[PDB]
Design a protein around this ligand. Sequence first.
Ligand SMILES: [Mg+2]
Ligand SMILES: [Mg+2]
Ligand SMILES: [Mg+2]
Ligand SMILES: [Mg+2]
Lengths: 260, 105, 290, 51, 224, 88
Amino acid sequence: QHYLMPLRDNFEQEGIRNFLSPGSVNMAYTEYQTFILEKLNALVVGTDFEQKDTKSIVLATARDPELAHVFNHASMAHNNHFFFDHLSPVPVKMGDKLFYHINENFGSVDTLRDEMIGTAVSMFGPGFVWLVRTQLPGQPVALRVMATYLAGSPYPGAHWRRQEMDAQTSIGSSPQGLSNGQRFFERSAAGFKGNKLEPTAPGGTDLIPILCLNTWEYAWLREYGTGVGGMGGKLAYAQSWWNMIDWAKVEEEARLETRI
Amino acid sequence: EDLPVIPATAVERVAWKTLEDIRKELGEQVKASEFARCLALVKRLNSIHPDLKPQEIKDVLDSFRRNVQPFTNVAKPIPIDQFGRACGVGKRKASSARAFVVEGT
Amino acid sequence: DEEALKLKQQIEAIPGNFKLFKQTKAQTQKLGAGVEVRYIPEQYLRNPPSDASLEDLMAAQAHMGHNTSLWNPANARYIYGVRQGIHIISLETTATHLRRAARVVEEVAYRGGLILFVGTRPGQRPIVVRAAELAKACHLFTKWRPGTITNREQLLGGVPLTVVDELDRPLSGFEDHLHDRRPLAPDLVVCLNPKENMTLLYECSLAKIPTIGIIDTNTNPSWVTYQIPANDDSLRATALISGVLGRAGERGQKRRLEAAQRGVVTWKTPADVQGYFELASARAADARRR
Amino acid sequence: QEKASLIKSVDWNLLENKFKNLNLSFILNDASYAERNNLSELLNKLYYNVL
Amino acid sequence: GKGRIFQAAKVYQRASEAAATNIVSGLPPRNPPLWLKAIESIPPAEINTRPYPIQHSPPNPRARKPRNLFRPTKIVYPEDELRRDFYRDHPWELARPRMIIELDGKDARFLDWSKGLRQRGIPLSGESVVQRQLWLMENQGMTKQEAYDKARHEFYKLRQLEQMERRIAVEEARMVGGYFGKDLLTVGMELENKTYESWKKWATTEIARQESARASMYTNVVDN
Amino acid sequence: PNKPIRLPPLKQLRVRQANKAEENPCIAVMSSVLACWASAGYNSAGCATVENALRACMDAPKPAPKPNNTINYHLSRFQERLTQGKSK
RNA sequence: GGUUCGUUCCAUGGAAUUAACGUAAACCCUUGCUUUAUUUGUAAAUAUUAUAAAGCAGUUCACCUUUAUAUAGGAAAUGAU
Ligand SMILES: [Mg+2]
Ligand SMILES: [Mg+2]
Ligand SMILES: [Mg+2]
Ligand SMILES: [Mg+2]
């Protein structure tokens, strides 16, 4: 069975100093992750996924429509832990190599900050904001921001459940509506028939999620409240989160090609 | 086994040894079926990517290569005389003809 | 023609993609939660258990006997009952007979004996070869050639031998003895399918060699010396049984080597080699004389 | 091994296959190696010499 | 008497006697086999001796000269009755694939049927309803029918939620741009097409043979 | 209706002829020709269409032999398991 | 039990593992080609009949088909040769 594993740096016992209270992280990870895993176990208690890790379940049950409910709990457990495995007790100084790559793709360090935070609030829904590393066959290593909805997965192997943008507020009769609508049907039609729209390198090495931001309401509506009048809320949660990003780890997992 | 593999159409051809060649060098009466399943391994281990292929697999795979070269017997082409007459030879049951063919009427 | 060259730079990417793919597999994997992996198919080979519990024997289908009709009534002392139209072998009878066999494999290996693990079935080759490595014994995963024990002079005539010592290292000086010496015979045969190869077991009885076999509900228990009542048709039970016996030999070979480093040999020279000693000095006696 | 057959393969160590053109003029004329034109040097590289 | 005589259970006795004395009288015996001292204190076990097997059900107290006394008996438990009753009322409960391969055999250590149907390690199956039924029928002193209803109703409410998740999960995913692959319904029809076509060919071929046979059967030897 | 018996111990379980013998198709066309002659005449016109069919046969090449059937090999495997056993 | 011109080859057997003779292979003549030799043989000749020493060559390749996936077979003036 899947059991809850401890956190990175003793957060369950003390919690981050200026980001999340010890009781908030208790309700965010210990009490919730255990709840998801409890539900996950019951779903794969007598299947082949009984001994498979979360990621293996995230990729195996991506396209199958009868196992969609299993993908949610699996990807939710992965995305949740992925978000806590990148924080640190004290802010870390961004690396020189990484600091130079960000400017080449976003102009400045803060330009990326306001983009991720802006995407979180603009999304207005439970999801995850990802900082993916996309590298095509002949293209250099380039970074970009990607947003995923309730239980979306950034990996290419799970493109069937990326859940990048909503359909209720992005598919209409306007010029942008028709375009978005066409892409929606083109994907469903291609995915069903088995045709792939965008070639992907073997091994899913195209996108490598480096950083994540859990915008789910159960993680911040207690520590930062609703946010009446602009004090606290979801906005302040995203801002404070930027201070605890383990930029050292973000650089290691980035694996940027030596170019300087 | 975790190393990648190359499609069967991209692996260069190799002339592996036959059952008779192995029976001789080993001095054993190897079974044809047991050897057929052993040759599949060599074909499988041969599809590994050359660059990623380790050194041990390379050497052990060289002991199964059949380095036989058939004899070459190419006939000499019939030349044409300076005057344009080519000489062909034919025989039938006792005979030996010699025809000199030239452009004519 | 690029359509035929576009497969090359793809092949040039396999080393890069593989390296990057393996690195990516180390970070993201195992993030979500910890899995309680409590069974792997290839666990009886990578790390076989020292002993087998009632749960290991039951999980390996070691209690599944043959159909009730296809049974040897003599071997009914080990049957627990009947269910699903088959005979259920008592789990407690298998564990007891297995531990007793593991004691025979250890003592025989501890006294410098030659063991032979025999499993002759489609998928019993990796199991027997693995157990032989642990116990430093010989393996056999093919049809037993009739006469390899009673007619060893002819069959095993050209196969080479060697003379070792306390610490199992070669001894130079027995070259002349390794040409008149007759072939060897196993001191203990561990068969994993006594029902199939009865020619091997009969030769052992004729040659006064102890034997260990997995006696199924339809196998005759009078063919081996130490029976291990269990399911021999299950490739998962055979791996566990052979795994336990492999660990026994390994544990026995260790004590033998640990006792040799202290100058305590746990075995005396064999009769055949012993004879070649007194004759050796006899030839040397002529040198002193003449 | 005694009853094993023998595969027919070109033996390139035979003096007939080594030098397809047997004439000394072609061989000793700096064919592959340099300044080995001496006939004795060529023979020593083919036969076992006692002198 | 065709079978050969196996003396494997006496190798130590026979081998030990052959090593007690030397063939050449007057000399000390040579060293014995290296296995003689290994199994010195491990004699074989008694074999070929029919005992009274375990009786898993009370034997007929009325038989005056019963037979099959040395014959193993059938293993019957109280659940066997309940399993048959449940799976007959729910035949399609057998179509649900269930794994019988055991991982470590310790699945029974965490089964406390006093809590409910959902347990650790085992899936929600007809077995969980039987064990839960048996527990209530024993501890809470319930009747076979009463305990059956209770455990049976808890089984439905859990099965309903599992079927509702599949529908709501797919629909929810598509509202945020989630596309899936071919469903089992479409995949099943495509396979029937490939098989039906093969039958069309066979029928077409056979139909031709039958009509051709009729032409040959009728006598058209002379055309007038 | 009783069920099939369990075969006694046999020296070998096998079918005498594994491969079905295919009747020469042109002995059937000849039978038809012999029929026209009797009903009508040896030298008549109604026999032209049938006689040509017989000539078309012997001009056509013989089909290739069918692959050997491996039934006897599988019967030898399951002999002891299907019957009472083997004899001799 | 299959296969093969063949106790040939493969598989298999609760008994097999091997040796000699015959078989097979190889040998002689013959067929194609290569190299050497040119009289007493060859019109000429830059070498092609003949003469005769050695060496190579086949069911080899291609195509079709193929059992138990182990051993292979078919096609015969319109693939090569
Ligand atoms: Mg059995
Ligand atoms: Mg034989
Ligand atoms: Mg002259
Ligand atoms: Mg000539």
